[PDB]
Design an enzyme around this catalytic site. Structure first.
Site, PDB file in Angstrom:
ATOM      1  N   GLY A 152       0.128  22.600 -35.024  1.00  0.00           N
ATOM      2  CA  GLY A 152      -0.040  21.163 -35.048  1.00  0.00           C
ATOM      3  C   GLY A 152       0.875  20.539 -33.998  1.00  0.00           C
ATOM      4  CG  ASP A 153       3.141  17.993 -34.638  1.00  0.00           C
ATOM      5  OD1 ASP A 153       2.103  17.784 -35.299  1.00  0.00           O
ATOM      6  OD2 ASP A 153       4.276  17.879 -35.134  1.00  0.00           O
ATOM      7  CD  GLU A 154      -1.404  21.844 -32.087  1.00  0.00           C
ATOM      8  OE1 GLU A 154      -1.741  20.690 -32.518  1.00  0.00           O
ATOM      9  OE2 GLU A 154      -1.439  22.875 -32.822  1.00  0.00           O
ATOM     10  CE  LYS A 189      -3.216  18.306 -33.688  1.00  0.00           C
ATOM     11  NZ  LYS A 189      -2.545  18.250 -34.994  1.00  0.00           N
ATOM     12  N   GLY A 205      -0.020  13.306 -38.291  1.00  0.00           N
ATOM     13  CA  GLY A 205       0.601  12.174 -37.660  1.00  0.00           C
ATOM     14  C   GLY A 205       0.188  12.368 -36.234  1.00  0.00           C
ATOM     15  CG  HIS A 206      -3.461  12.781 -35.292  1.00  0.00           C
ATOM     16  ND1 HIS A 206      -4.768  13.194 -35.135  1.00  0.00           N
ATOM     17  CD2 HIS A 206      -2.956  13.530 -36.305  1.00  0.00           C
ATOM     18  CE1 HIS A 206      -5.041  14.147 -36.012  1.00  0.00           C
ATOM     19  NE2 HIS A 206      -3.957  14.368 -36.733  1.00  0.00           N
ATOM     20  NE  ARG A 263     -13.949  25.269 -60.748  1.00  0.00           N
ATOM     21  CZ  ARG A 263     -14.228  26.463 -61.274  1.00  0.00           C
ATOM     22  NH1 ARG A 263     -15.486  26.881 -61.380  1.00  0.00           N
ATOM     23  NH2 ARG A 263     -13.226  27.205 -61.738  1.00  0.00           N
ATOM     24  CD  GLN A 296      -2.314  19.261 -41.128  1.00  0.00           C
ATOM     25  OE1 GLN A 296      -3.437  19.407 -41.608  1.00  0.00           O
ATOM     26  NE2 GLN A 296      -1.632  18.122 -41.250  1.00  0.00           N
ATOM     27  N   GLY A 304       1.060  12.909 -19.716  1.00  0.00           N
ATOM     28  CA  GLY A 304       1.806  11.856 -20.394  1.00  0.00           C
ATOM     29  C   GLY A 304       1.238  11.371 -21.712  1.00  0.00           C
TER      30      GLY A 304
HETATM   31  N1  LIG Z   1       5.165  13.789 -22.419  1.00  0.00           N
HETATM   32  C1  LIG Z   1       3.996  13.844 -23.056  1.00  0.00           C
HETATM   33  N2  LIG Z   1       3.928  13.402 -24.321  1.00  0.00           N
HETATM   34  C2  LIG Z   1       2.709  13.583 -24.804  1.00  0.00           C
HETATM   35  C3  LIG Z   1       1.647  14.151 -24.173  1.00  0.00           C
HETATM   36  N3  LIG Z   1       0.547  14.180 -25.009  1.00  0.00           N
HETATM   37  C4  LIG Z   1       1.014  13.624 -26.149  1.00  0.00           C
HETATM   38  N4  LIG Z   1       2.272  13.251 -26.088  1.00  0.00           N
HETATM   39  C5  LIG Z   1       3.054  12.664 -27.070  1.00  0.00           C
HETATM   40  O1  LIG Z   1       3.526  13.799 -27.704  1.00  0.00           O
HETATM   41  C6  LIG Z   1       3.413  13.686 -29.127  1.00  0.00           C
HETATM   42  C7  LIG Z   1       2.232  14.535 -29.703  1.00  0.00           C
HETATM   43  O2  LIG Z   1       2.620  14.366 -31.032  1.00  0.00           O
HETATM   44  P1  LIG Z   1       1.539  14.366 -32.145  1.00  0.00           P
HETATM   45  O3  LIG Z   1       0.949  13.052 -32.224  1.00  0.00           O
HETATM   46  O4  LIG Z   1       2.139  14.741 -33.417  1.00  0.00           O
HETATM   47  O5  LIG Z   1       0.433  15.369 -31.765  1.00  0.00           O
HETATM   48  P2  LIG Z   1      -0.839  15.446 -32.632  1.00  0.00           P
HETATM   49  O6  LIG Z   1      -0.437  15.569 -34.070  1.00  0.00           O
HETATM   50  O7  LIG Z   1      -1.627  16.642 -32.173  1.00  0.00           O
HETATM   51  O8  LIG Z   1      -1.662  14.220 -32.430  1.00  0.00           O
HETATM   52  C8  LIG Z   1       3.313  12.181 -29.375  1.00  0.00           C
HETATM   53  O9  LIG Z   1       4.557  11.666 -28.994  1.00  0.00           O
HETATM   54  C9  LIG Z   1       2.403  11.843 -28.196  1.00  0.00           C
HETATM   55  O10 LIG Z   1       2.306  10.470 -27.814  1.00  0.00           O
HETATM   56  C10 LIG Z   1       1.723  14.596 -22.915  1.00  0.00           C
HETATM   57  O11 LIG Z   1       0.810  15.153 -22.309  1.00  0.00           O
HETATM   58  N5  LIG Z   1       2.960  14.394 -22.347  1.00  0.00           N
HETATM   59  O1  LIG Z   2     -16.065  29.930 -61.386  1.00  0.00           O
HETATM   60  P1  LIG Z   2     -17.261  30.768 -61.286  1.00  0.00           P
HETATM   61  O2  LIG Z   2     -16.963  32.125 -61.823  1.00  0.00           O
HETATM   62  O3  LIG Z   2     -17.736  30.848 -59.884  1.00  0.00           O
HETATM   63  O4  LIG Z   2     -18.427  30.131 -62.178  1.00  0.00           O
HETATM   64  C1  LIG Z   2     -18.794  28.702 -62.020  1.00  0.00           C
HETATM   65  C2  LIG Z   2     -20.205  28.386 -62.258  1.00  0.00           C
HETATM   66  O5  LIG Z   2     -20.858  28.902 -61.137  1.00  0.00           O
HETATM   67  C3  LIG Z   2     -21.869  29.832 -61.586  1.00  0.00           C
HETATM   68  N1  LIG Z   2     -21.965  31.057 -60.961  1.00  0.00           N
HETATM   69  C4  LIG Z   2     -20.981  31.698 -60.214  1.00  0.00           C
HETATM   70  N2  LIG Z   2     -21.432  32.567 -59.396  1.00  0.00           N
HETATM   71  C5  LIG Z   2     -22.787  32.538 -59.592  1.00  0.00           C
HETATM   72  C6  LIG Z   2     -23.715  33.281 -58.937  1.00  0.00           C
HETATM   73  S1  LIG Z   2     -23.434  34.514 -57.663  1.00  0.00           S
HETATM   74  P2  LIG Z   2     -25.007  35.067 -56.924  1.00  0.00           P
HETATM   75  O6  LIG Z   2     -25.455  36.265 -57.700  1.00  0.00           O
HETATM   76  O7  LIG Z   2     -26.136  34.157 -56.747  1.00  0.00           O
HETATM   77  O8  LIG Z   2     -24.440  35.447 -55.605  1.00  0.00           O
HETATM   78  N3  LIG Z   2     -24.989  32.971 -59.326  1.00  0.00           N
HETATM   79  C7  LIG Z   2     -25.226  32.080 -60.339  1.00  0.00           C
HETATM   80  N4  LIG Z   2     -24.303  31.364 -60.996  1.00  0.00           N
HETATM   81  C8  LIG Z   2     -23.119  31.631 -60.538  1.00  0.00           C
HETATM   82  C9  LIG Z   2     -21.473  30.278 -62.978  1.00  0.00           C
HETATM   83  O9  LIG Z   2     -22.772  30.777 -63.339  1.00  0.00           O
HETATM   84  C10 LIG Z   2     -20.963  28.916 -63.464  1.00  0.00           C
HETATM   85  O10 LIG Z   2     -22.164  28.111 -63.561  1.00  0.00           O
HETATM   86  O1  LIG Z   3       1.467  20.766 -47.406  1.00  0.00           O
HETATM   87  P1  LIG Z   3       1.642  20.079 -46.125  1.00  0.00           P
HETATM   88  O2  LIG Z   3       1.920  18.636 -46.368  1.00  0.00           O
HETATM   89  O3  LIG Z   3       0.444  20.247 -45.267  1.00  0.00           O
HETATM   90  O4  LIG Z   3       2.901  20.702 -45.361  1.00  0.00           O
HETATM   91  C1  LIG Z   3       3.010  22.170 -45.170  1.00  0.00           C
HETATM   92  C2  LIG Z   3       3.689  22.594 -43.942  1.00  0.00           C
HETATM   93  O5  LIG Z   3       2.767  22.312 -42.933  1.00  0.00           O
HETATM   94  C3  LIG Z   3       3.397  21.439 -41.970  1.00  0.00           C
HETATM   95  N1  LIG Z   3       2.705  20.330 -41.530  1.00  0.00           N
HETATM   96  C4  LIG Z   3       1.636  19.702 -42.162  1.00  0.00           C
HETATM   97  N2  LIG Z   3       0.903  19.009 -41.380  1.00  0.00           N
HETATM   98  C5  LIG Z   3       1.496  19.151 -40.154  1.00  0.00           C
HETATM   99  C6  LIG Z   3       1.074  18.609 -38.983  1.00  0.00           C
HETATM  100  S1  LIG Z   3      -0.347  17.545 -38.716  1.00  0.00           S
HETATM  101  P2  LIG Z   3      -0.637  17.269 -36.937  1.00  0.00           P
HETATM  102  O6  LIG Z   3       0.107  16.027 -36.562  1.00  0.00           O
HETATM  103  O7  LIG Z   3      -0.374  18.308 -35.944  1.00  0.00           O
HETATM  104  O8  LIG Z   3      -2.097  17.022 -37.049  1.00  0.00           O
HETATM  105  N3  LIG Z   3       1.855  18.992 -37.928  1.00  0.00           N
HETATM  106  C7  LIG Z   3       2.979  19.752 -38.115  1.00  0.00           C
HETATM  107  N4  LIG Z   3       3.402  20.268 -39.277  1.00  0.00           N
HETATM  108  C8  LIG Z   3       2.588  19.946 -40.234  1.00  0.00           C
HETATM  109  C9  LIG Z   3       4.552  20.762 -42.676  1.00  0.00           C
HETATM  110  O9  LIG Z   3       5.230  20.355 -41.475  1.00  0.00           O
HETATM  111  C10 LIG Z   3       5.004  21.982 -43.488  1.00  0.00           C
HETATM  112  O10 LIG Z   3       5.538  22.886 -42.490  1.00  0.00           O
HETATM  113  O1  LIG Z   4       2.544  14.912 -36.293  1.00  0.00           O
HETATM  114  C1  LIG Z   4       2.719  15.129 -37.478  1.00  0.00           C
HETATM  115  N1  LIG Z   4       3.716  16.061 -37.921  1.00  0.00           N
HETATM  116  O2  LIG Z   4       4.838  16.225 -37.090  1.00  0.00           O
HETATM  117  C2  LIG Z   4       3.974  16.208 -39.373  1.00  0.00           C
HETATM  118  C3  LIG Z   4       5.436  16.055 -39.732  1.00  0.00           C
HETATM  119  O3  LIG Z   4       6.215  15.511 -38.918  1.00  0.00           O
HETATM  120  O4  LIG Z   4       5.823  16.425 -40.869  1.00  0.00           O
HETATM  121 MG   LIG Z   5       1.160  15.180 -34.847  1.00  0.00          MG
END
Ligand SMILES: Nc1nc2c(ncn2[C@@H]2O[C@H](COP(=O)(O)OP(=O)(O)O)[C@@H](O)[C@H]2O)c(=O)[nH]1
Ligand SMILES: O=P(O)(O)OC[C@H]1O[C@@H](n2cnc3c(SP(=O)(O)O)[nH+]cnc32)[C@H](O)[C@@H]1O
Ligand SMILES: O=P(O)(O)OC[C@H]1O[C@@H](n2cnc3c(SP(=O)(O)O)[nH+]cnc32)[C@H](O)[C@@H]1O
Ligand SMILES: O=CN(O)CC(=O)O
Ligand SMILES: [Mg+2]
Ligand SMILES: Nc1nc2c(ncn2[C@@H]2O[C@H](COP(=O)(O)OP(=O)(O)O)[C@@H](O)[C@H]2O)c(=O)[nH]1
Ligand SMILES: O=CN(O)CC(=O)O
Ligand SMILES: [Mg+2]
Lengths: 431, 431
Positions: free
Chosen positions: B12-14, B16, B40-41, B143, B224, B416
């Site tokens: 994550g944080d590349e 996006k 957190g984008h 569920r 992520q 940037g």
């Molecule tokens: N210097 C620089 N900062 C960047 C670039 N692309 C994104 N950022 C910044 O780098 C960070 C990317 O963080 P983050 O939002 O968490 O990435 P995301 O979660 O994939 O959206 C934020 O500060 C962005 O504004 C880049 O190409 N250069």
């Molecule tokens: O939590 P599980 O064990 O998956 O069961 C939840 C519900 O899904 C239904 N159920 C689970 N697997 C099947 C299958 S597998 P297949 O032979 O088609 O691959 N088929 C029919 N009901 C299922 C089960 O009959 C119940 O209605």
């Molecule tokens: O159960 P969650 O809340 O997803 O957290 C589990 C772990 O995943 C990590 N974590 C969750 N989401 C992110 C993201 S989202 P993005 O901004 O890249 O889309 N980024 C970085 N660490 C994350 C968190 O930092 C911790 O290391």
């Molecule tokens: O961009 C979002 N991440 O960095 C998640 C975090 O900071 O926990």
């Molecule tokens: Mg981020």
């Protein structure tokens, strides 16, 4: 094309087992990408019956390597049990079966839990299969579940288990007031077969990458069906995993863009096992005749299946969710002897609205009634027919209609449980 | 092509956010298919900053309809909160945002739980973001979770909640000995914004089907990154969902075969936030310089990010899992001023083995050390450069190498934070 996906477009039991086994003739690999041993597939070769649960249905072919992908919930117990039964029949399981270290492990307490939750639900139970599929998917997602890879360092596995088991027993005992599961017996039973398991480990994800880069015919075999999809299914009356075509990539490690063709197994009528919405469900003689005539009992729990008419509204949801490429029409023979046949074509909503779309969540199906479209039957016999030619005109028509209402071609039509009681019009592998 | 997927190939944080926002210029829709507000984008337009968490990063464009797919875990609280902040700034959120009735709801107790589990883990905590992402995914899979659709019939929603809340409080109180969450305040807060939410409901899955059949440019925005994938990530130090390209179909409802191009966001160096394996992690000045120079703090929790060299071994796992089609190389500018730059090209296993593949599970990474491949840096400035031409040769070379080691073309290079500090060599939409 090279990667072919075979799944259930309805509520499971459409005929995945037979179809996987029939088409694997041409494939190197077979990958189960989700579920566990709740599934019950059923292959019949030359009249000899094998009902697979957790082992891929490509297991009866020496030239195919059966893989159980990381999406699957693996019960060491059940695996060993199915393994021995296949081995007693000369199928060298251990020789053709590979597995993922990412596969979560279903242990005794998972069943303990499932039993509890269901009882708690009292009168509104999901009607699950009894394994601990649900709880295992939860532990997975909760990041406390034990996975196949953990079986390697066994000293630490034992710390982890004691820890998780301590957690689940407190609830079982104090909350559900159920009897706890012993940590020692779990540890022992698991450890007794650890080595067997770890032996089949492979990096399935990287495996599929090269299989693909080479050009190998791979087949993904799905468990359950679309309307049972944890996300897009009749929640909460669903299984705890994505039975829809997206579980392929998430449950194997193959890049999503590498699915070439998606085959939907479509049963000719509908059956459902478990609690849940079923618009076209029958409770009359034709309902009985369908169950009776199609030996409609679960290949895993023994439960009689709820039978009904083929629902086009629901299947069309399958088409779009799974990006179908074709349908394999199964159990046509079961309809023989019916004067006329009906397929639900639209839904009558509770407020008077007529729709051709499906609700999404048990509740949102609370009063929908189906709008059929009666077609004449055929008293002729279609059993084991291996060619359209032997199919009567009514049949050809009932089949053509399905294509119209869905816009999806019926590539395979099946006339019997036997690998050979089938017609292949267009083979997914060479398209 | 029409459907373009943008995800994080690392932890994550590349980048996006910026990239989604930059490319949406041409798209009708933008779909978040997984995660919640842990994400957190960060978009920066003309120097003005917006950090999105749960709302799709296509929100700042009137001509794009932002959708939050069923895979996402929806916090009514956080949604309303982000909504108002965007509205105060003239972005008519409610006007351009649609949502799924299948989206699970994150409520106060989910956070209560997350806090508990983490504390229980004592010294081996995952280092989660604090929302209740995990517990919400569990309830989903169990569920018993509440979904957006449930908000409709409110009388029953209240039965369901009382029921689930009763369950979770017993544990919180009796087990974790934590203070329970009140059912009344949860019910009230949720009900106060119910109508707002239900207002944005649409059948996203069927929506994507027609958008597609028409030819609409759709963009999936991922949260992520790959190594955080519940399945294929460094378990258990992962997020509770599939951040890999398979969550697209499972988290939107679009057929998997309709992904046309998959774009991987690749940061030029590596950063990680949270506990977990990090082969190429730095603890020296260059490590400091990377965090400092790239303002590497989480856009959601405030936590300093662990910085390291760009790991080719790990990214190559991303290529295959996601079926990448291209890379968008981000934050190149951050490396300016470094004498030389290194990229991990192979892993040295604990037993002496040299491998170019990654382990799978925190533990299985326990002693791996990276085998770099030093490249010379460049003291020239690359900031906001909008053309290869302005990029110095070292840079061009460091970039060409990445292509060699991965076999994946760098289609976009970013200089940037600003929407415009970027070079687009090949636009995913017209390929
Ligand atoms: N210097 C620089 N900062 C960047 C670039 N692309 C994104 N950022 C910044 O780098 C960070 C990317 O963080 P983050 O939002 O968490 O990435 P995301 O979660 O994939 O959206 C934020 O500060 C962005 O504004 C880049 O190409 N250069
Ligand atoms: O939590 P599980 O064990 O998956 O069961 C939840 C519900 O899904 C239904 N159920 C689970 N697997 C099947 C299958 S597998 P297949 O032979 O088609 O691959 N088929 C029919 N009901 C299922 C089960 O009959 C119940 O209605
Ligand atoms: O159960 P969650 O809340 O997803 O957290 C589990 C772990 O995943 C990590 N974590 C969750 N989401 C992110 C993201 S989202 P993005 O901004 O890249 O889309 N980024 C970085 N660490 C994350 C968190 O930092 C911790 O290391
Ligand atoms: O961009 C979002 N991440 O960095 C998640 C975090 O900071 O926990
Ligand atoms: Mg981020
Ligand atoms: N009459 C008939 N039975 C069939 C046909 N295809 C499969 N079967 C049988 O019907 C049942 C399908 O059940 P099941 O194995 O649960 O389906 P699966 O879970 O999708 O593999 C088993 O008895 C099969 O042997 C068919 O085309 N005609
Ligand atoms: O084929 C398998 N099913 O019928 C599951 C069950 O019977 O519960
Ligand atoms: Mg079955």
């Amino acid at each position: 094309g090279n990667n072919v996906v075979v799944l259930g477009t309805q509520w499971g039991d459409e005929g995945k087992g037979k179809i996987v086994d029939l088409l694997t003739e041409r494939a190197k690999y077979v990958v189960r990408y989700q579920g566990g041993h709740n599934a019950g597939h059923t292959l019949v070769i030359n009249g000899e019956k094998t009902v697979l649960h957790l082992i891929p249905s490509g297991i009866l072919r020496e030239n195919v390597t059966s893989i159980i992908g990381n999406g699957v919930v693996l019960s060491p117990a059940a695996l060993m049990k199915e393994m021995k039964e296949l081995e007693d029949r000369g199928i060298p399981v251990r020789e053709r079966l590979l597995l993922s270290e990412a596969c979560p492990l279903i242990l005794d307490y998972h069943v303990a839990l499932d039993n509890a939750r269901e009882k708690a639900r009292g009168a509104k139970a999901i009607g699950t299969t009894g394994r601990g599929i649900g709880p295992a998917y939860e532990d997975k997602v909760a990041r406390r579940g034990l996975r196949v890879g953990d079986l390697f360092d066994k000293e630490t596995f034992a710390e982890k288990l004691k820890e998780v088991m301590e957690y689940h027993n407190f609830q079982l005992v104090n909350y559900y007031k159920a009897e706890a599961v012993d940590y020692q017996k779990v540890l022992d039973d698991t450890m007794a077969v650890a080595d067997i398991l770890t032996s089949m480990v492979v990096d399935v994800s990287d495996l599929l990458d090269q299989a693909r880069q080479r050009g190998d015919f791979v087949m993904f075999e799905g468990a359950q069906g679309t309307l049972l999809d944890i996300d897009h299914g009749t929640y909460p009356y669903v299984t705890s995993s994505n039975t829809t075509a997206g579980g392929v990539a998430t449950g194997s490690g193959l890049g999503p863009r590498y699915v070439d063709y998606v085959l939907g197994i479509l049963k000719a009528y509908s059956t459902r096992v478990g609690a849940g919405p079923f618009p076209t469900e029958l409770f009359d003689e034709t309902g009985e005749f369908l169950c009776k005539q199609g030996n409609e009992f679960g290949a895993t729990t023994g439960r009689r299946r709820r039978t009904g008419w083929l629902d086009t509204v629901a299947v069309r949801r399958a088409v779009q969710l799974n990006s179908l490429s074709g349908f394999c029409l199964t159990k046509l023979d079961v309809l023989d002897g019916l004067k006329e046949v009906k397929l639900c074509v639209a839904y009558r909503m509770p407020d008077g609205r007529e729709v051709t779309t499906t609700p999404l969540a048990a509740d949102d199906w609370k009063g929908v009634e189906p709008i059929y479209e009666t077609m004449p039957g055929w008293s002729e016999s279609t059993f084991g027919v291996k060619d359209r030619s032997g199919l009567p005109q009514a049949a050809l028509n009932y089949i053509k209609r399905i294509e119209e209402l869905t816009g999806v071609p019926i590539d395979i039509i099946s006339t019997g449980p036997d690998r050979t009681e089938t017609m292949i019009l267009r083979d997914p592998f060479d398209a």
